Design a protein around this ligand. Structure first.
Ligand SMILES: CCCCCC/C=C\CCCCCCCCCC(=O)O
Ligand SMILES: N[C@@H]1[C@@H](O)[C@H](O)[C@@H](COP(=O)(O)O)O[C@@H]1O
Length: 133
């Protein structure tokens, strides 16, 4: 059900990422580097375990999870959160909860591109990833 998301993806457009980071309390110097970083995201499955790697020249992350089962996560910006990833309307929806706060990381395939929408507070960031062969 998650198969068209699988593979290696490269960032090719970003809108409002500074707003999103600032909403999360990320400091100005980190935002500055992040605004010039183009991550590679690798999504793989093994049975119903997904592994999502995010690689860059600044920070790397990796998470593994089963759809629909909560997992602990420590984010790129060092938030310790309770997470769950599900499919919803064909979109991969990742919800993070901590300190009563929430943020969603929603991935959808549109015309073969992977569109990542990040929402926290009022901030809405849209990042476009393109498949690598
Ligand atoms: C590992 C690389 C994280 C993105 C590169 C910037 C690095 C650090 C700044 C704090 C980011 C925090 C929220 C990341 C949201 C996902 C971005 C995406 O997957 O596009
Ligand atoms: N296990 C932690 C992660 O939970 C946290 O996300 C990361 C910060 O990012 P980076 O590894 O790029 O410093 O540090 C470790 O790897």
């Amino acid at each position: 059900m998650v198969d068209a998301f699988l593979g290696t993806w490269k960032l090719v457009d970003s809108k409002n990422f500074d707003d999103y980071m600032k909403s999360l309390g990320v400091g100005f110097a980190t935002r500055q580097v992040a605004s010039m970083t183009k991550p590679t995201t690798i999504i793989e499955k093994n049975g119903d375990i997904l592994t999502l790697k995010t690689h860059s020249t600044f920070k790397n992350t990796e998470i593994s999870f089963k759809l629909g089962v909560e997992f602990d996560e420590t984010t790129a910006d060092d938030r310790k959160v309770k997470s769950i990833v599900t499919l919803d309307g064909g979109k991969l929806v990742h919800l993070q909860k901590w300190d009563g706060q929430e943020t969603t990381l929603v991935r959808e395939l549109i015309d073969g591109k992977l569109i990542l929408t990040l929402t926290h507070g009022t901030a809405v960031c849209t990042r476009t990833y393109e498949k690598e062969a």
